Design an enzyme around this catalytic site. Structure first.
Site, PDB file in Angstrom:
ATOM      1  N   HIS A  27       0.849  -1.206   0.000  1.00 26.15           N
ATOM      2  CA  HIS A  27       0.000   0.000   0.000  1.00 26.15           C
ATOM      3  C   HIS A  27       0.869   1.235   0.000  1.00 26.15           C
ATOM      4  CE1 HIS A  27       0.222  -0.531   4.460  1.00 26.15           C
ATOM      5  NE2 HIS A  27      -0.066   0.774   4.589  1.00 26.15           N
ATOM      6  N   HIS A  54       1.638   3.796   2.045  1.00 25.38           N
ATOM      7  CA  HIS A  54       2.060   4.473   3.261  1.00 25.38           C
ATOM      8  C   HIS A  54       3.576   4.396   3.291  1.00 25.38           C
ATOM      9  CE1 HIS A  54      -1.883   4.271   5.919  1.00 25.38           C
ATOM     10  NE2 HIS A  54      -1.829   5.399   5.194  1.00 25.38           N
ATOM     11  N   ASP A  72       5.932   3.416   5.391  1.00 24.55           N
ATOM     12  CA  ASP A  72       6.593   2.180   5.772  1.00 24.55           C
ATOM     13  C   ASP A  72       6.735   1.183   4.624  1.00 24.55           C
ATOM     14  OD1 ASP A  72       3.728   1.950   6.174  1.00 24.55           O
ATOM     15  OD2 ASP A  72       4.074   0.114   7.363  1.00 24.55           O
ATOM     16  N   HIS A 125      -7.323  -1.487   6.241  1.00 25.79           N
ATOM     17  CA  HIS A 125      -6.358  -0.572   6.808  1.00 25.79           C
ATOM     18  C   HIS A 125      -6.190   0.675   5.944  1.00 25.79           C
ATOM     19  CE1 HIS A 125      -2.535   0.988   8.246  1.00 25.79           C
ATOM     20  NE2 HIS A 125      -2.067   0.829   7.026  1.00 25.79           N
ATOM     21  N   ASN A 128      -3.803   4.204  13.620  1.00 23.96           N
ATOM     22  CA  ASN A 128      -4.318   5.347  12.897  1.00 23.96           C
ATOM     23  C   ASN A 128      -5.304   4.874  11.831  1.00 23.96           C
ATOM     24  OD1 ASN A 128      -4.409   7.453  10.745  1.00 23.96           O
ATOM     25  ND2 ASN A 128      -3.127   8.569  12.223  1.00 23.96           N
TER      26      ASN A 128
HETATM   27  C1  X8Z Z   1       2.765   4.604  10.003  1.00 25.38           C
HETATM   28  C2  X8Z Z   1       2.106   3.245   9.890  1.00 25.38           C
HETATM   29  C3  X8Z Z   1       1.577   3.040   8.486  1.00 25.38           C
HETATM   30  S1  X8Z Z   1       0.799   1.456   8.267  1.00 25.38           S
HETATM   31  C4  X8Z Z   1       0.987   3.195  10.897  1.00 25.38           C
HETATM   32  O1  X8Z Z   1      -0.062   3.785  10.683  1.00 25.38           O
HETATM   33  N1  X8Z Z   1       1.142   2.453  12.095  1.00 25.38           N
HETATM   34  C5  X8Z Z   1       2.278   1.769  12.429  1.00 25.38           C
HETATM   35  C6  X8Z Z   1       1.977   1.063  13.730  1.00 25.38           C
HETATM   36  C7  X8Z Z   1       0.467   1.372  14.014  1.00 25.38           C
HETATM   37  C8  X8Z Z   1       0.087   2.461  12.989  1.00 25.38           C
HETATM   38  C9  X8Z Z   1      -0.098   3.804  13.662  1.00 25.38           C
HETATM   39  O2  X8Z Z   1       0.798   4.690  13.599  1.00 25.38           O
HETATM   40  O3  X8Z Z   1      -1.163   4.033  14.295  1.00 25.38           O
HETATM   41 ZN    ZN Z   2      -0.378   1.694   6.324  1.00 28.29          ZN
HETATM   42 ZN    ZN Z   3       2.307  -0.300   8.103  1.00 27.22          ZN
END
Ligand code: X8Z
Ligand code: ZN
Ligand code: ZN
Length: 221
Positions: free
Chosen positions: A80, A82, A84, A143, A174
């Site tokens: 996707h 994002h 990461d 997600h 998030n």
């Molecule tokens: C930055 C990444 C992209 S998948 C994210 O949203 N994470 C990573 C761990 C959980 C969640 C968050 O920040 O709420």
């Molecule tokens: Zn993501």
């Molecule tokens: Zn992620």
């Protein structure tokens, strides 16, 4: 077998003879945030599922695996748009590493100022790299709108990516980009397609099994 760089910000962990999980730490507000993908050691090169948070980490990941396995990274599947997942796209493109994605992931990457992956993957796409078979599957929105999973039918290993939460995740994280009324249906579509699963690799956290899918369903209640 687990192998790390100096600071421990990059680690590779062996699932089997030709499949490893790559994990990198990004730093946000003083907090280390791990992210997982896959390294596939094939007879025709290395294939990654996902890059990493940024270009610096992506370069170092590539260099680590090329040295260890003594062959080049040829292809990456981006699951996707994002950071990461796609943060290393500049590195991939300038090195001539193919960056596969759905059209929607490419459309979102462009909208958000990243260089574009290929947009070549359909709802179901079957790829073969040397003898390594890889299926990509878009199960629906969850997600993110565009999230895909990756299946290795020779091992019944599912890369759930960030659609699938680890046991340690106690909430959905998030959800600004998420579809919380559809995410359960998308998880059910994965469970329908792949009825016999060995490992499941989440986008963040420890490797697990089909239980991670059920855990994600519970978090969506
Ligand atoms: C930055 C990444 C992209 S998948 C994210 O949203 N994470 C990573 C761990 C959980 C969640 C968050 O920040 O709420
Ligand atoms: Zn993501
Ligand atoms: Zn992620």
């Amino acid at each position: 077998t687990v192998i790390k760089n100096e600071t421990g910000t990059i680690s590779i962990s062996q699932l089997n003879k030709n499949v490893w999980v790559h994990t990198e730490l990004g730093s946000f507000n003083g907090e280390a945030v791990p992210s997982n993908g896959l390294v596939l050691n094939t007879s025709k090169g290395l294939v990654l599922v996902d890059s990493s948070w940024d270009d610096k980490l992506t370069k170092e990941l590539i260099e680590m695996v090329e040295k260890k396995f003594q062959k080049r990274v040829t292809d990456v599947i981006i699951t996707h748009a994002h950071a990461d997942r796609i943060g290393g796209i500049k590195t991939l493109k300038e090195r001539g590493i193919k960056a596969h994605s759905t059209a929607l992931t490419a459309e979102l990457a462009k909208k958000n100022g990243y260089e574009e992956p290929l947009g070549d993957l359909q709802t179901v796409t079957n790829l073969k790299f040397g003898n390594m078979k890889v299926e990509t599957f878009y199960p629906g929105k969850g997600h993110t709108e565009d999230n895909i999973v990756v299946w290795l039918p020779q091992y019944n290993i599912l890369v759930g990516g960030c659609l699938v939460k680890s046991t340690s995740a106690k909430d959905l994280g998030n959800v600004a980009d998420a579809y919380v009324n559809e995410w359960s249906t998308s998880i059910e579509n994965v469970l329908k397609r792949y009825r016999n699963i060995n490992a499941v690799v989440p986008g963040h956290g420890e490797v697990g099994d089909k239980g991670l899918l059920l855990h994600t369903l519970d978090l969506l209640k």
